[PDB]
Amino acid sequence: GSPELREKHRALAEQVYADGQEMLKNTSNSPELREKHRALAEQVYATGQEMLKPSPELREKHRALAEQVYATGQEMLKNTSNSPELREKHRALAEQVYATGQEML
Numbered sequence: 252g253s254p255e256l257r258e259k260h261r262a263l264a265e266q267v268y269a270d271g272q273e274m275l276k277n278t279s280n281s282p283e284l285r286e287k288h289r290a291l292a293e294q295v296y297a298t299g300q301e302m303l304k305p306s307p308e309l310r311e312k313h314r315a316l317a318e319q320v321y322a323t324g325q326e327m328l329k330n331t332s333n334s335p336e337l338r339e340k341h342r343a344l345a346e347q348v349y350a351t352g353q354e355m356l
């Protein structure tokens with residue numbers, strides 16, 4: 252429907268992934284970086300919704316996984332330090348979101 256919106260979503264997704272990976276490599280991240288990631292997360296989520304307004308079952312899966320990853324991140328917003336356990340459970344989920352989005356491409 253709108254390729255411009257799809258590519259905005261993609262580019263935002265890429266940037267979420269980069270600071271995610273960047274943040275993974277540090278025991279403590281500045282609030283600036285943590286906030287960039289999460290503002291970007293908010294905008295990929297928003298652009299994804301905008302597109303719902305491939306197959307329906309694949310979009311459904313991706314959407315459900317997005318919500319789960321976003322809800323997971325919100326819990327991490329309350330923590331000055333997120334542990335390996337938390338950080339890796341979030342990474343695993345986020346990986347499934349990326350995969351399913353790429354499966355639609």
Ligand code: HEM
Binds near residue numbers: 257302
């Ligand atoms: C929030 C985290 C999300 C991430 C990291 C994410 C990531 C991606 C990625 C990487 C793609 C493939 C883009 C490409 O390579 O061209 C994609 C496509 C897509 N995403 Fe998401 N997504 C997210 C959330 C959502 C949500 C919440 C929705 C819907 C409510 C959504 C709907 C879509 C749709 C419909 C496409 C395919 C668009 C098209 O084919 O024209 N996404 N997503």
Ligand code: HEM
Binds near residue numbers: 346
């Ligand atoms: C794909 C969609 C993703 C969404 C919607 C998302 C969302 C969030 C949110 C809302 C937070 C809370 C921010 C904070 O604690 O300050 C967060 C934290 C985090 N995310 Fe993500 N994230 C995604 C992908 C990733 C990926 C792929 C990685 C790693 C490769 C990652 C690594 C992290 C890390 C390490 C934190 C914690 C930062 C810290 O404790 O200093 N995220 N994420």
Ligand SMILES: [Cl-]
Binds near residue numbers: 329330331332333
């Ligand atoms: Cl804490």
